[PDB]
Amino acid sequence: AEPEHDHRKRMGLKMLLMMGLLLPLVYAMKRHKWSVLKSRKLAYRPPK
Amino acid sequence: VSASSKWLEGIRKWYYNAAGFNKLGLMRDDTIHENDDVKEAIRRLPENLYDDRVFRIKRALDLSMRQQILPKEQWTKYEEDKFYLEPYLKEVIRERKEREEWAKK
Amino acid sequence: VSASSKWLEGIRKWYYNAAGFNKLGLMRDDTIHENDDVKEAIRRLPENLYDDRVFRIKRALDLSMRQQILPKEQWTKYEEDKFYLEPYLKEVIRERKEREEWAKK
Amino acid sequence: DEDAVPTLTPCRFTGSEIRHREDGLPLAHVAIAVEGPGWANPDNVALQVANAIIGHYDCTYGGGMHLSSPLASVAVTNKLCQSFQTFNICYADTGLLGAHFVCDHMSIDDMM
Amino acid sequence: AAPTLTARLYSLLFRRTSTFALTIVVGALFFERAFDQGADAIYEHINEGKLWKHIKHKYE
Amino acid sequence: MLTRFLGPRYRQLARNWVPTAQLWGAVGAVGLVWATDWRLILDWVPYINGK
């Protein structure tokens, strides 16, 4: 059934890293995008 | 938005401190789910009003994204809230009650 | 549309008695496959002309559906056909040759 | 003389956009700019020339079918805007030189 | 430096779009075989339960 | 109708695109490499040597 219980096990290891790498890198990128929108200043200054 | 209405409209005041609306400083009227009656209702809204509800709405979106809220101080003054539409709205309630009325006729 | 051109343009005359166009009484110019140059070319067409080519075209559709043709007498007069666009068209040929020209420049 | 004669400490100008948000603005008076002259830099020479390549597409200007700025051209063909004018905004060594503009609900996107 | 990493490696690397890409795959090699290797090391220190067996299998 | 894009103008256009053209080309090629790791090329790869 799971001889790759060895082999597949191996892959899982890299997975642990990929996310830990990407997941941050991903999240970053997301923030990297959204950041400006975060801080926006839009003014309600109705005339008079 | 005061104690009976800070329990009850304190689902909108203390429990929209919990359910958010007024502690988010929302506009009571603005909470009505958009409907057709609501729609043209707003179409008839007053202008200076329109601006007001606008800034309110946008801001709401703003902190919403920010997932923050204004100072609890800045959190809206309880009671002390004009029912903005309700004259206008409720008027329309009579309207669609009228179109609805002669409609019934 | 006469013998050299009733053999050759008598692919459009005797052999558009066979290929139909002129015996169908078509407009020589009208036969140009629609292209952009053709397009705005017509956009610039003359008015009374425009009507003329119109009636021609529609009629063509008409018998076409009818799958009939006009009297062979009514079948178009050979030769004796103004080249309608060709001054206008060919002018445009110079045009797109001009846009094409300074274009080349 | 006496005191108070500092120099220009470089920094970033705003870097933003804002709409004075107007339903009341009947039609866009739009614009844009990218470095305009100011006092200093040696570059602006060609940037001048560059802004030349840029150019200002005048509403009152005619001849769009034949217009030189390809931008201007399509703007005619597409009827793609109601104005653009390369406009050089000045600070010693930096600025923005670029189009004013006018447009309806549409242009700006393709404009850029 | 790191300013030429961020910058020159933008400029002399990440600037040109292609260059950014060619850089990318250029890594794809090194990363690929490397992580392959060190990964194998991880599993290696993990056990020694087989395929080290040959010597024990007396590797005829 | 190559004359359409044949002119010192568009010629110059090519002269521009050329180095870039090299660049994207390289992109494709190397892609074939790493993607495939095709033995044919793979051989020459030192320390990318997998055995």
> From the list F23, F34, F48, which residue is nearest E25 (CB)?
F34
Of the CA atoms within 13 Å of residue C69, those in its CB half-sphere come to 17
Residue C39 CB burial class (10 angstroms; 0-12, 13-18, ≥19): exposed
Residues in chain B closer than 8 A to A44 (CB atoms):
51, 54-55, 58-59
User: B32 phi and psi, to 5 degrees?
Assistant: -60, 130
Check CB contact under 8 Å for E43 and A14: no
* B48, B55, B65 member nearest A44 (Cβ): B55
CA D43 to chain centre: 18
Q: How far apart are CA B82 and CA C79, in angstroms?
A: 88
How many interface pairs between A and E have CB atoms less than 8 angstroms apart?
11
Domain extent listing, chain A: 4-48
CA contacts within 13 A on the Cβ side of E48: 3
- List residues bridging with D88 in a β-sheet: D97
* CA contacts within 13 A on the Cβ side of D21: 10
Q: How many whole angstroms separate alpha carbon B53 and alpha carbon B50?
A: 5
**How many other β-carbons are positioned within 10 Å of the β-carbon of residue B95?**
16
Residues 45-84 of B with CB under 8 A from A: 48, 51, 54-55, 58-59, 62, 65-66
Residue labelled with tokens 């003389």 = D1
> E interface toward F at CB cutoff 8 Å?
16, 18-19, 21-22, 25-26, 28-29, 32-33, 36
Hey, what are B55's tokens? 């800034």
CA distance B31 to B13: 13
**Cα E22 from Cα E30, distance rounded (Å):** 13
Rounded Cα gap, residues B5 and B83, in angstroms: 14
Query: In whole angstroms, what is the distance from residue C91 CA to residue C46 CA?
Result: 13
Q: Which residue carries 């006009």 as its tokens? A: C70
Q: Rounded CA gap, C100 and B47, in Å?
A: 56
| Alpha-carbon span D79 to D65, nearest angstrom | 10
Distance, in Å, from the CA atom of D31 to the CA atom of D107, rounded to the nearest integer, reads 11
C33 three-class SS: coil
Interface-testing mutation among E24, E40, E43, with chain A (most A C-beta atoms within 10 A): E43
What DSSP designation does A15 have? H
**Can you name the residues that pair with C81 across neighbouring β-strands?**
none
Three-class SS state of D97: strand
- Tell me the three state secondary structure of residue D29: strand
Cβ(D34)–Cβ(D100) below 8 Å = no
Picking from A6, A9, A14, the nearest residue to E35 by CB comes out as A14
The verdict on a CB contact (< 8 Å) between F23 and E29 is no
Contact C13, C2 (CB under 8 A): yes
Name the minimum distance, in Å, from the CA of B55 to any CA of chain A.
6
Q: Quick one: which H or E segment has residue C7?
A: helix C3-7
Confirm or reject contact between A7 and chain E (CB < 8 A): no
**Inter-chain contact A44–B62, Cβ cutoff 8 Å?**
no
Nearest CA-CA partner of D37 in D110, D98, D112: D98
Cα of B68 to nearest chain A Cα, Å = 11
Contacts of D47 (CB under 8 A, 6+ apart): D35, D37, D97
Report the structure determination method: cryo-EM
Nearest-CA neighbor of B20 among B50, B83, B79, B63?
B63
Torsion sign across C-alpha atoms C56, C62, C67, C68? negative
Q: Is E35 helix (H, G, I), strand (E, B) or coil?
A: helix
**Domain A4-48 adopts which CATH fold?**
1.20.5
Residue whose C-alpha is closest to residue D86's, from D44, D20, D15, D35: D35
Q: How many Å apart are CA C84 and CA C53, to the nearest integer?
A: 9
With CA atoms as reference, report the closest residue to D98 among D25, D47, D22. D47
Burial of C30 (0-12, 13-18, 19+ CB in 10 A): middle
